[PDB]
């Protein structure tokens, strides 16, 4: 219903900060959790800009607009928010600054971006209820429902007035990012993770892989959307944990809004079931998470702390099951 913009007050106070000597070092590594610097988390987002991007790859005015605005596009919901976003952005910065030359100043720009917006206006309902409840996002919106949206919601932020920081690009650099950014936020959509990982993998094994070619490019960087996406499993344990209560919180609740509506969900979303919760991780690590992990090191041998990182988590998941749990403390 329509799109927020961001308070004179808000974006004037985000041009003036800056981030404390000691993140500067944490902050370029995989495992950083922006957790507990709230406060922070606008102006960490314009730091790795300036890091990775240059300080004048965006009028600053226009920069401060679009995140500010961005922020309070993101909805009170106890996963897909604000957090999320700027921790999906940061997953994608570490990458980055660790592969730097590997992709152009338009696909970094964008992907930074992208990661930022790719929940953007997030219902905390997944495709499967928008389609099984013939919400109207699912008939206009047939395949990848929520993200085509989320791209959509973008776009009406970039067409904001004073918040559009690509208009200095040429009409057919213009053209190209919105394309990084639509195929980067399609490619969060988890349906499509299935092939495409089997694709690459497949590439990568019998070495047809070749980022010079645009089709194999787009797929690399679709693993690494959902590499970021998913960073929630290659924090430290602690971390991984109140994350997922997180997740969890968010699918319970969709879950009771189908029982009200007459329908039994599934397991993952079901309270009374918690149960059933470490086993579901686990099959989650096992078909998702790892391989998600294991191809993107093959194919970019930088980004391996985070697949070492899943495997740690993995291991935890199943020191709980063997019922080995520590407090946690929620
Ligand atoms: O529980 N899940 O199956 C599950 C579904 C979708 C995204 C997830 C991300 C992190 C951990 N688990 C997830
Ligand atoms: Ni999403
Ligand atoms: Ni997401």
Same mark, same amino acid.
């Given at each position: 219903?329509?799109?927020?913009?961001?308070?004179?007050?808000?974006?004037?106070?985000?041009?003036?900060?800056?981030?404390?000597?000691?993140?500067? #070092?944490?902050?370029? &590594?995989?495992?950083?959790?922006?957790?507990?610097?709230?406060?922070?988390?606008?102006?960490?987002? @314009?730091?790795?800009?300036?890091?990775?991007?240059?300080?004048? *790859?965006?009028?600053?005015?226009?920069?401060?607009?679009?995140?500010?605005?961005?922020?309070?596009?993101?909805?009170? @919901?106890?996963?897909?928010?604000?957090?999320?976003?700027?921790? @999906?952005?940061?997953?994608?910065?570490?990458?980055?600054?660790?592969?730097?030359?590997?992709?152009?100043?338009?696909?970094?720009?964008?992907?930074?971006?992208?990661?930022?917006?790719?929940?953007?206006?997030?219902?905390?309902?997944?495709?499967?209820?928008?389609?099984?409840?013939?919400?109207?996002?699912?008939?206009?919106?047939?395949?990848?429902?929520?993200?085509?949206?989320?791209?959509?919601?973008?776009?009406?932020?970039?067409? &904001?007035?004073?918040?559009?920081?690509?208009?200095?690009?040429?009409?057919?650099?213009?053209?190209?990012?919105?394309?990084?950014?639509?195929?980067?936020?399609?490619?969060?959509?988890?349906?499509?993770?299935?092939?495409?990982?089997?694709?690459?993998?497949?590439?990568?094994?019998?070495?047809?892989?070749?980022?010079?070619?645009?089709?194999?490019?787009?797929?690399?960087?679709?693993?690494?959307?959902?590499? *970021?996406?998913? *960073?929630?499993?290659? #924090? &430290?344990?602690?971390?991984? #944990?109140?994350?997922?209560?997180?997740?969890?919180?968010?699918?319970?609740?969709?879950?009771?809004?189908?029982?009200?509506?007459?329908? +039994?969900?599934?397991?993952?979303?079901?309270?009374? #079931?918690?149960?059933?919760?470490?086993?579901? +991780?686990?099959?989650?690590?096992?078909?998702?998470?790892?391989?998600?992990?294991?191809?993107?090191?093959?194919?970019?041998?930088?980004?391996?702390?985070?697949?070492?990182? *899943?495997?740690?988590?993995?291991?935890?998941?199943?020191?709980?099951?063997?019922?080995?749990?520590?407090?946690?403390?929620?």
């Amino acid at each position: 219903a329509g799109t927020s913009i961001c308070t004179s007050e808000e974006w004037q106070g985000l041009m003036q900060f800056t981030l404390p000597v000691r993140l500067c #070092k944490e902050i370029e &590594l995989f495992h950083f959790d922006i957790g507990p610097f709230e406060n922070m988390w606008p102006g960490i987002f @314009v730091y790795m800009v300036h890091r990775s991007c240059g300080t004048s *790859c965006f009028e600053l005015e226009k920069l401060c607009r679009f995140i500010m605005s961005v922020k309070k596009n993101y909805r009170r @919901v106890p996963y897909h928010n604000w957090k999320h976003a700027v921790t @999906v952005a940061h997953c994608m910065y570490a990458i980055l600054q660790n592969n730097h030359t590997l992709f152009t100043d338009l696909e970094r720009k964008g992907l930074l971006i992208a990661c930022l917006c790719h929940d953007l206006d997030h219902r905390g309902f997944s495709n499967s209820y928008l389609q099984k409840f013939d919400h109207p996002l699912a008939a206009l919106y047939s395949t990848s429902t929520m993200e085509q949206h989320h791209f959509s919601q973008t776009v009406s932020i970039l067409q &904001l007035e004073g918040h559009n920081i690509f208009s200095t690009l040429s009409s057919s650099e213009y053209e190209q990012v919105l394309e990084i950014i639509r195929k980067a936020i399609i490619a969060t959509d988890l349906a499509l993770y299935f092939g495409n990982r089997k694709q690459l993998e497949e590439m990568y094994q019998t070495g047809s892989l070749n980022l010079n070619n645009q089709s194999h490019r787009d797929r690399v960087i679709g693993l690494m959307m959902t590499a *970021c996406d998913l *960073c929630s499993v290659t #924090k &430290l344990w602690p971390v991984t #944990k109140l994350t997922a209560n997180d997740i969890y919180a968010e699918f319970w609740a969709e879950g009771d809004e189908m029982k009200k509506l007459g329908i +039994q969900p599934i397991p993952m979303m079901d309270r009374d #079931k918690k149960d059933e919760v470490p086993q579901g +991780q686990l099959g989650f690590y096992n078909a998702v998470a790892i391989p998600c992990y294991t191809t993107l090191t093959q194919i970019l041998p930088p980004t391996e702390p985070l697949l070492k990182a *899943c495997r740690d988590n993995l291991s935890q998941w199943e020191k709980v099951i063997r019922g080995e749990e520590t407090a946690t403390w929620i």
